[model samples]
Target: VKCFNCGKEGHTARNHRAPRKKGCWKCGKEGHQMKDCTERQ
Candidate 1:
């Protein structure tokens, strides 16, 4: 599923992952779609 935010092609949008969350694409923020976010919704 593509990111419902910025349309990040690849992993599932809801499956957001981060450098810490492991398979968590939601970086806490909404700056870089789902591949580079670091804030909070």
Candidate 2:
């Protein structure tokens, strides 16, 4: 499973450590937001 709110490789959005941010919505990486995220589907 992958976290959509924290960018992890073993969890889901429901179990994310924190709230969703402006970064990748599917892999919470910094520097860019969800719209510019290349890691998302």
Candidate 3:
């Protein structure tokens, strides 16, 4: 679907638990995307 992780179907660009971007720059984790971070600037 190329929503958030670009590897799932039924998720928005706000939150996704997949490998799509720069390894979640929000926390440097692989659980979700970078832009999907909540506690971010």
Best by lDDT: 2
Q: In terms of TM-score, how similar is model 1 to the real structure?
A: 0.23
TM-score of each: 0.23, 0.36, 0.32
Write model 3 residue lDDT over 1-41, tens digit each, in one string: 66666655755666754445567766777666677666647
lDDT of 1: 0.50
Residue pairs in clash, model 2: none
Score candidate 3 by lDDT. Answer: 0.62
* Alpha carbon lDDT at 36, candidate 1: 52
- Runs of candidate 1 with Cα error greater than 4 angstroms are 18-41
- Mind giving the per-residue lDDT tens digits that candidate 2 earns over 1-41? 46866668655567554346656787777777576677736
Candidate 1 residue-wise lDDT, 1-41, digit = tens: 35756566654576544335443256544445455554454
Note each model's CA RMSD in angstroms: 8.8, 9.0, 7.3
Q: Which residue pairs in candidate 3 have backbone atoms (N, alpha carbon, C) closer than 3 angstroms, thus clashing?
A: none
Ranking by TM-score: 2, 3, 1
Of the candidates numbered 1 and 3, which has the greater TM-score value? Answer: 3
